[PDB]
């Protein structure tokens, strides 16, 4: 009983900047660690940014560093990823998924549908 919906996607010309949003809901309390992940059509999965809500320790791709930030809104039950200075490679579609631990990737579930991210 945890489900997470991401929005926020769309399309932009490099430089530019998009805030996605990852809406929980149902018993949240265990997920304690929450990442944002992409993937493009004929590519493997990547974690672009990571966030402990208890303690606010975050993590972030090398190539993301400096341009995307992840942040919380506990009243809002939301994690957002503000991505700016947008580059053609950050097209994809983006999806956030939470574990009460963070240690493996494998571990992290209850990602939505996604939303699109195209820069060009």
């Known amino acids: 009983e945890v489900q997470l919906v991401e929005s926020g996607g769309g399309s932009v010309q490099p430089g530019g900047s998009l805030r996605l949003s990852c809406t929980a809901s149902?018993?949240?309390?265990?997920?304690?660690?929450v990442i944002w992940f992409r993937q493009a059509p004929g590519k493997e999965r990547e974690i672009v940014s990571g966030?402990?809500?208890?303690?606010?320790?975050?993590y972030y791709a090398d190539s993301v560093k400096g341009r995307f930030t992840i942040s919380q809104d506990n009243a809002k039950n939301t994690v957002y990823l503000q991505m700016n200075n947008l580059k053609p490679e950050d097209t994809a579609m983006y999806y956030c998924?939470?574990?009460?631990?963070?240690?493996?990737?494998?571990?992290?579930?209850?990602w939505g549908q996604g939303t699109q991210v195209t820069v060009s």
């Open positions: 966030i402990s809500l208890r303690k606010g320790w975050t």
């Open positions: 149902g018993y949240t309390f265990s997920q304690e660690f």
């Open positions: 998924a939470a574990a009460p631990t963070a240690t493996h990737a494998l571990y992290f579930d209850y």
